[PDB]
Amino acid sequence: PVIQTFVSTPLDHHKRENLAQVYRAVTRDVLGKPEDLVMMTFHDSTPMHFFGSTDPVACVRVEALGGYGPSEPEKVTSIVTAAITKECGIVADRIFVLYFSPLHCGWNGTNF
Template sequence: MPFINTNTNVEISDEKREKLKSKLGQAIRILGKSEDWLMLSFEDKCDMYFKGDSSSPMAFVDVSVFGHSDDSACEKMTVELCSIYNDVLGISPDKLYVKYSGSTQWGWNNMNF
C-alpha cells in the first residue's frame, strides 16, 4: 500500500503525468511494493523555494509505505526517483527532496491492515 505524493513548482502536462505514473509504477518495485496498490498524487505549480530561490524547477517527493523499507532499498529508490524527475520534468537531482515513511497502521475498505 504505497503512496507517493509529489509537490513541484513545475507544471505537469497530461502527457508528463502519464509518464510519471508509469515510471513510478515500475520504480515502486525497488521497495518491494506493487503498482497494484500504488496511489499517486501530483500537486504542480506550487509556490516553492529552495535555499531562498524559486527560479529553478524543484520537487518534494513523499513516499509512504505500509511496513518498513530498508535503507539500501531507499537509497536505490532515491537514485531512481532523481532520474525519473530529471527525465520527465527537468528537475535536477540537487533540487529534489525525497522523504520516506512507513507505518503498520493503514486503513482501507472499512478495515485496517
C-alpha cells in the same frame, strides 16, 4: 504505498502518466509490493522556495506501511530523482525525496 509529488513547475498529462509508470515500477521492482496499490498524487505549480530561490524544485514524499528494506531507499531516491529530472527538467540538487512509514493504513474499509 503512497507517493505524493510536489513540483513548482506545471505538470501535464504526459508527465503525470510517465511518473506514474515509474512509481508503479519502483513499487513492484524495488519495494516488492503490488504496483496497483501505490496511490499517487500530483501537486504542480506549487509555490516553493529552496536554496535561495523559487526556481524549479521538487519534493517527493514516499509512505510505506512496514518501512523499507536496507537497500531500497537508496534505489528509490536514485530512480525518482532521475525520473523527475527527465520528466520535469528539475535538476538533481533541487529534488528532495522523503521517506515515511504510517502506523496504520486502511484500504477498502479495513486496515492492513
